[PDB]
Amino acid sequence: QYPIINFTTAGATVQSYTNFIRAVRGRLTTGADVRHEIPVLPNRVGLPINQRFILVELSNHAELSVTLALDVTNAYVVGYRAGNSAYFFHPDNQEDAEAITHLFTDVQNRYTFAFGGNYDRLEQLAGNLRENIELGNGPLEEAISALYYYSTGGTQLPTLARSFIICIQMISEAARFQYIEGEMRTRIRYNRRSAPDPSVITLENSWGRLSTAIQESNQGAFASPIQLQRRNGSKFSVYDVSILIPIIALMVYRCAPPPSSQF
């Protein structure tokens, strides 16, 4: 039922990763909602369950596969399937709890983790912050294997959490931000793994706020500036949507678009 996008870390190139992220974005957004040239994800309100999720099937050089489930309203990774078992993060609300019952329905073993899937919880379990977790094709290759082997006891909980953190950033954050996609393209081009710098971290942390600021803006102008960081950690202020057009690829729905002013 739900659309499937395939990606493999096996012989991954800049182009194959670019095709993948483009395909993910294409299945996340409908084209119905574009504001200041930036697409908005489907509104959760009144969204039919048959349109709620996309599936991301990740394969690796080790000949293993896992399937991530993403909520189309926010690109949130809600859980995964590896062979005969499926695992879901502790849902944040009753609606999201009902929604996940529609995923991986023919799987033999269904588990819901007792922990939620936000970075804060995952970093706690990993024993490391995002700033110290390396990203790139190698980390993703290893993450796929780690998710695959969880059900058989091969993967410790910290490794599982770290592996989720890798997948979320390389798929969902890359889908959300052209800038983050670019940072991952660079790592793939040179086959060099590295932890995300402050520019990546602050963008991830600010996605909700940026989405709201753009959507609530007066003709693109922010009421309140948003502070982001450069690669070197120095602060710069965002006052307007204009500067974000090359940076943010999609937004979470925050409010209705205002009517146009006419002469």
Ligand SMILES: Nc1nc2nc(C(=O)N[C@@H](Cc3ccc(F)cc3)C(=O)O)cnc2c(=O)[nH]1
């Ligand atoms: N499973 C999963 N988890 C995710 N978690 C995050 C995430 O934790 N974002 C943070 C961003 C943030 C961080 C700090 C703040 F002060 C405000 C926002 C949050 O919402 O608290 C963001 N995205 C995802 C995701 O796509 N899938």
Ligand SMILES: Nc1nc2nc(C(=O)N[C@@H](Cc3ccc(F)cc3)C(=O)O)cnc2c(=O)[nH]1
């Ligand atoms: N399907 C699903 N979605 C979830 N979404 C969030 C979450 O933080 N949602 C935010 C939107 C958001 C989503 C991701 C971000 F990186 C930032 C903001 C909200 O409710 O305003 C948090 N948890 C979940 C979850 O457990 N399942």
